[PDB]
Design a protein around this nucleic acid. Structure first.
Length: 86
DNA sequence: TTTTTTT
């Protein structure tokens, strides 16, 4: 299960659900011709207090292909900063 | 405080 690095933005996030998706726009330091969705759980989000992503906020993350699809493993804001959230 | 794969 190879671990890759990517960036993108929050496609959507539902706080009642505790999960959402990231639209990945770069991967392994190269931009993608077409964005790819990557699953993100609230538990993976680097921030203090209650954990969420705002729609649209820019993210940096590690991910791995999973049986259910891609799975984020740790998500941060630009430059390793905390995610913004709602 | 948050239904672990869709929006």
């Amino acid at each position: 299960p190879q671990v890759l690095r990517g960036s993108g933005h929050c496609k959507w996030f539902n706080v009642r659900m505790g999960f959402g998706f990231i639209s990945m726009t770069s991967r392994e330091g190269s931009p993608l011709e077409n964005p790819v969705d990557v699953f993100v759980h609230q538990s993976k989000l680097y921030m203090e207090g209650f954990r969420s992503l705002k729609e649209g906020e820019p993210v940096e993350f590690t991910f791995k292909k999973s049986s259910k699809g891609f799975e984020s493993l740790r998500v941060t804001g630009p430059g390793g900063n905390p995610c913004l959230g709602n």
